[PDB]
Amino acid sequence: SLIKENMRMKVVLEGSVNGHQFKCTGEGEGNPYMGTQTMRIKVIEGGPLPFAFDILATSFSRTFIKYPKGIPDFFKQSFPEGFTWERVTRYEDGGVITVMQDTSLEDGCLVYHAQVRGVNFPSNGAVMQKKTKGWEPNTEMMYPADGGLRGYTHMALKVDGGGHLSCSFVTTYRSKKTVGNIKMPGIHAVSHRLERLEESDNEMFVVQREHAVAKF
């Protein structure tokens, strides 16, 4: 397969949140067939970010989902060309973030480009005040949709003082394949656990890992 048991990734993610422009770069590796990955991320422009890095964390990798025998893997089948994803995330207190992402494969490395735009986060809220504490584990429902997939998520962002902020989104996953076939899965789910491993004081440097497993 073009997707090996060990694969490296690199990412450029840029955009703005509440008018604050930034750019990040990341690089990492994982085992796509075990659904595990780690990435090391630096804020290279606009730092220190005046908002929680957690709102960006889920924008930095669908090739690394452990899919059983019996659920077709849309993502791995999309190579060499790869896939795109487009997401809007809506937070219960009115933040909205739109993300556009491209996934390519270049010289044996997965290459990601993401653009993000967040607006209307309350200035006083946990995101803009940097009072968040990571994401609860969650399950994304995956639906077949006219040759692509729609993912649907309700996630809980932990906040200081024993709170959460709920958010939801729909993701549209599209293949870039111009030659060849894709076997489409049926409805399924993907269980995620996204963990912050390292961070610097002002989140200029973050290391995170994910474990993602598909199920019926």
Residue numbers in the entry: 3 to 62, 66 to 221
What does the report in the manuscript say about this coordinate set?
GECIs are prominent tools to monitor [Ca2+] in defined cells and intra-cellular compartments. To create a red GECI, we selected the red fluorescent protein (FP) mRuby (an engineered variant of eqFP611 exhibiting high thermodynamic stability and monomericity) and replaced cpEGFP with circularly permuted mRuby in the GCaMP3 scaffold. To aid our protein engineering efforts, we sought to solve the crystal structures of mRuby, RCaMP, and R-GECO1. High-resolution crystal structures of mRuby in several states, as well as a structure of a Ca2+-loaded RCaMP variant, aided optimization of the red GECI scaffold to useful performance levels.
